[PDB]
Amino acid sequence: MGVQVETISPGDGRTFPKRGQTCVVHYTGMLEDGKKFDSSRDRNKPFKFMLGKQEVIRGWEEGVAQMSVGQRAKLTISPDYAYGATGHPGIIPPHATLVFDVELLKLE
Template sequence: MLLLREMGVEVKTIKAGDGKTFPKQGDLLTMHYVGTLKDGTKFDSSRDRGKPFQFTIGVGQVIRGWDEGVMKMSLGEKAKLEITSDYGYGSSGAGDVIPPNADLDFEVCFRLKSSMFV
């Protein structure tokens, strides 16, 4: 298992990607994910909905831990993102689902990339 650390986010590779196709700021990404609290409680899953999540990387559409962690993944990679609360939802939390100051884990699979700047 490959491990990459940044402040606030740790990327643990579960399955290697192609090693050459990395997202750039402004790319539209399609990913599956499962989000859990540190105690293992699942709070969200694109897999449960049967529809992958699409977002633009590096423009603040997602939490900072995703913006920074996913940028280190290559196409096809499956990884676990371990995100500290300051790179997640911080002292606010997220509704009744994510408590304040919660560290989060996401199992993510980087499936598709398309550039918005063509």
């Protein structure tokens, strides 16, 4: 599968990220069992990435593009849109489905 977007709280319903814009988000990443492996909130610093530059996994590129500014949403991402068969040594296992809690704070 790809990425499933499930809303948590609504944004403005009008402003969606376009390619080349910088997305400013807070996020929490969990394995399918619910174990947290990464979180910008624990660092108290939002995470920024430019859409369309492949600085993030494909599930983020296609999932955050479907969010409006101010929205919080749950992204469920299958391994092909994620870290794949390889996974990531010591953090992400092989063939992992990942769940992200993502809040799109603003676009720059």
